[PDB]
């Protein structure tokens, strides 16, 4: 909630960005900590929360996806399947003894035909995930204090057919707005993108 995560999906890509803040009660431990975990070749999650639960949840999900790929002879899972698996994990956590994962997720991915018989999703996919186990497909989503600040901004400026460069400029505007309006210092924003070629780490926007 202190750290703001942004994501928006366009015609040919999904761009996500995650603040790199890590703090101890008022002290900035570091400002460059990547909170975007790549799950599959064309899948990633931007997670907001404290380091422990976030890392444990992302590593659990990634390891389970890898194990499924091993036991299914390298068959990559669709974005909806992975999103539902994460949602089931989060929902099961909230009724367990160890408690709920205090992690808010923006899950981004690109679906490609696994074989010639495939007839599923082909475009990009974006999912908003609450820590309680909420899952919703959205054109754009945000978490953290600046989230609302970005959301209206996106409602003002987002278009379905934005190009990569114009999307980069839009993400730069969103990060600038978060830096401008949030008292919590989010100096660096760790932007990544998912396209048909996989995951790219974008350094221009930060």
């Amino acid at each position: 909630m202190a750290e703001t995560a942004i994501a928006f999906r366009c015609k040919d890509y999904v761009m996500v960005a995650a603040a790199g803040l890590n703090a101890f009660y008022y002290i900035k431990i570091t400002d460059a900590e990547d909170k975007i975990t790549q799950l599959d070749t064309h899948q990633l999650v931007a997670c907001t929360g404290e380091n422990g639960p976030r890392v444990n949840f992302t590593e659990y999900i990634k390891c389970n996806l890898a194990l499924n790929r091993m036991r299914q002879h390298g068959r990559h899972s669709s974005c909806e399947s992975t999103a539902n698996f994460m949602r089931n994990c989060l929902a099961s956590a909230i009724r367990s003894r160890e408690g709920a994962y205090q992690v808010n997720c923006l899950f981004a991915g690109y679906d490609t035909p696994v074989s010639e018989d495939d007839d599923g999703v082909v475009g990009p996919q974006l999912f908003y995930m609450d820590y309680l186990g909420t899952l919703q497909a959205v054109p754009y989503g945000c978490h953290g204090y600046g989230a609302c600040f970005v959301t209206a901004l996106l409602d003002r400026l987002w278009r379905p057919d934005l190009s990569q460069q114009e999307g980069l400029e839009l993400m730069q505007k969103c990060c600038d707005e978060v830096k401008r309006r949030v008292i919590i210092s989010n100096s660096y924003f760790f932007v990544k993108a998912v396209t048909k070629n996989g995951v790219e780490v974008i350094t221009a926007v930060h």
Partner: protein
């Protein structure tokens, strides 16, 4: 539950169940592994082309992990169970230590599982 001693010693110091499992291995498809300067080659017998099998290819060499591959001789279903155990062990290792399991670590785990199969009651 059923935990009768199945693998027991014989009056000549032999474990008959282990010898019979080895004999079952002796009737399996052949497999060879060769170690090179920068490559490891695994070849398996690939029983035959029945003309009735699926046109889609299926591998008889199994990917336990991104760096570790396995081939077997013997009973196919027991081999599949062992391979599933090895894959789960690799994932648990890479989840408890953040590092990928070495080949020797996984081999030791598999050998330990096979050993425990020879000393557990009812199995």
């Amino acid at each position: 539950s059923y935990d009768r001693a199945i693998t027991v010693f014989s009056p000549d110091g032999h474990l008959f169940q282990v010898e019979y499992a080895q004999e079952a291995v002796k009737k399996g498809l052949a497999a060879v592994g060769v170690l090179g300067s920068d490559s490891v080659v695994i070849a398996v017998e690939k029983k035959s082309a029945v003309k009735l099998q699926d046109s889609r290819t299926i591998r008889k060499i199994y990917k336990v992990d991104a760096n570790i591959y396995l081939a077997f001789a013997g009973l196919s279903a027991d081999a599949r169970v062992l391979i599933n155990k090895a894959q789960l062990e690799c994932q648990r290792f890479s989840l408890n230590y953040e590092d990928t399991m070495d080949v020797d670590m996984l081999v030791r785990y598999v050998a330990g599982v096979q050993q425990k199969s020879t000393q557990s009651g009812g199995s």
